[PDB]
Design a protein around this ligand. Structure first.
Ligand SMILES: OC[C@H]1O[C@H](O[C@H]2[C@H](O)[C@@H](O)[C@@H](O)O[C@@H]2CO)[C@H](O)[C@@H](O)[C@@H]1O
Length: 451
């Protein structure tokens, strides 16, 4: 805290460059800027924020900011009208939640099909043609590709190609009631991916690392990653090339576009110095170059910097892909969506489940769940975090724990209160549904249905 700045940024981004622009700020304001790069920063921020700590400003793809805002963890930004002109308007929209601009857009990210130019003169024009390309390829001790399968971000570009989609853009907003992770398309993709993990084409444990080392070492002719990774493929030169993502079942592979944004903590002692830095030092050709030269940002939201940088081919490819797909939504429900698909891909791809069984759940874990009212909020005062005990008689439960559905309530309430999932209670859905099904057998008993 205090009168000096501290900021969080993901470990794969150029935080050394960010700290570099911080030494400049310091040198011109006498305010030491400290950059950090925690693990599960996206999940760790909303946790550390409530308990006094947390950075003065946090960096992350915009899709995660709707939630922070909802919880009142972020302070609305106040960029000049003139300063809003220096940034593309679409990057500003991806950062406006409920009419309030809640974060500064930095750069738009989009996964691309990276291919070893020395191995593959002509990259796979098709996704389903990878099996016949990894064929004549394995015939040398090399696979066709290796990307992080532990993160739904990298696998989703496929799953959505033939119709898979998160939250439909119904009316003027994202309809949390309309989810498409369990339709024919989503299954056509997930089927193929686990159809490539079965044909031995690629193990189902591959990491971001295990997948980066496998390309940085001429191990595999391809991989799927973003702008921030280009820096290591150049360091340990592998004569790579960045192009459009392979098409699946016809239509293009559509990646979920992300806009790296800087958010100002609501409880940031330095909320004006945050502005000075982000607005006058980072979001400038010099400032963005300092970060970029460390770990590519690829396609920045600064009109000036971008225009004369769309010249680069890899950047043009990144953008072409960003066009094939859709920009991620910022709503609070994204956190859960990502949970559902992360889990669904981890099971349907490890044999733990089948595509049908896995996505069926993904759809239920992404969709809205009932009960929330009679459990989350005031009712939680029954739970004593110290002992971890529940007072089923505390008037805060409204008596819910004692009646026709007393057992069902108890099961759902305790699960949410003992939950350590992300977001909390996302593992208690079925129990919240089971409880809801019980409210319906005694409708005269409940008004927890009045809606
Ligand atoms: O996993 C590395 C990847 O993380 C981010 O994508 C996240 C997204 O921001 C989260 O809100 C959630 O959806 O999980 C995604 C990964 O599955 C970054 O935006 C991306 O740049 C980074 O490479």
């Amino acid at each position: 805290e205090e009168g000096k700045l501290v900021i969080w940024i993901n470990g794969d981004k150029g935080y050394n460059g960010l700290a570099e622009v911080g030494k400049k700020f310091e040198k011109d304001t006498g305010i030491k800027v400290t950059v950090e790069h925690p693990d599960k920063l996206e999940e760790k921020f909303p946790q550390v924020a409530a308990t006094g700590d947390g950075p003065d400003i946090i960096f992350w793809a915009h899709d995660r900011f709707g939630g922070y805002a909802q919880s009142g963890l972020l302070a609305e930004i106040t960029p000049d009208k003139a300063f809003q002109d220096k940034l593309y308007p679409f990057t500003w929209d991806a950062v406006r939640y409920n009419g309030k601009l809640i974060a500064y857009p930095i750069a738009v990210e989009a996964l691309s099909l990276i291919y070893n130019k020395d191995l593959l003169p002509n990259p796979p024009k098709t996704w389903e043609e990878i099996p016949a390309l990894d064929k004549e390829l394995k015939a040398k001790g090399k696979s066709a590709l290796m990307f992080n399968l532990q993160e739904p971000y990298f696998t989703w570009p496929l799953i959505a190609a033939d119709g898979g989609y998160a939250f439909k853009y119904e009316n003027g907003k994202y309809d949390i009631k309309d989810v498409g992770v369990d339709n024919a398309g989503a299954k056509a993709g997930l089927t193929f991916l686990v159809d490539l993990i079965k044909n031995k084409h690629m193990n189902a444990d591959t990491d971001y690392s295990i997948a980066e080392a496998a390309f940085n070492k001429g191990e595999t002719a391809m991989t799927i990653n973003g702008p921030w990774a280009w820096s290591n493929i150049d360091t340990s030169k592998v004569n790579y090339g960045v192009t459009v993502l392979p098409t699946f079942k016809g239509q293009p592979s559509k990646p979920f576009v992300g806009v790296l944004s800087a958010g100002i903590n609501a409880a940031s002692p330095n909320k004006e110095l945050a502005k000075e830095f982000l607005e006058n030092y980072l979001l400038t050709d010099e400032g963005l170059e300092a970060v970029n030269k460390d770990k590519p940002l690829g396609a920045v939201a600064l009109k000036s910097y971008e225009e004369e940088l769309a010249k680069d081919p890899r950047i043009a490819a990144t953008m072409e892909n960003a066009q094939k797909g859709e920009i991620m939504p910022n709503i609070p429900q994204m956190s859960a969506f990502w949970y559902a698909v992360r889990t669904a891909v981890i099971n349907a791809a490890s044999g733990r489940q089948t595509v049908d069984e896995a996505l069926k759940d993904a759809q239920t874990n992404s969709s809205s769940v009932p009960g929330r009212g009679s459990i989350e909020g005031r009712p939680e005062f029954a739970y004593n975090p110290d002992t971890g005990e529940i007072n089923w008689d505390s008037p805060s439960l409204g008596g819910m724990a004692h009646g026709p559905c007393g057992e069902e309530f108890k099961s759902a309430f305790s699960c949410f209160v003992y939950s350590e999932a992300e977001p909390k209670g996302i593992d208690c859905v079925e129990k919240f549904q089971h409880m809801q099904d019980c409210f319906r057998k005694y409708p005269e008993h409940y008004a927890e249905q009045l809606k």
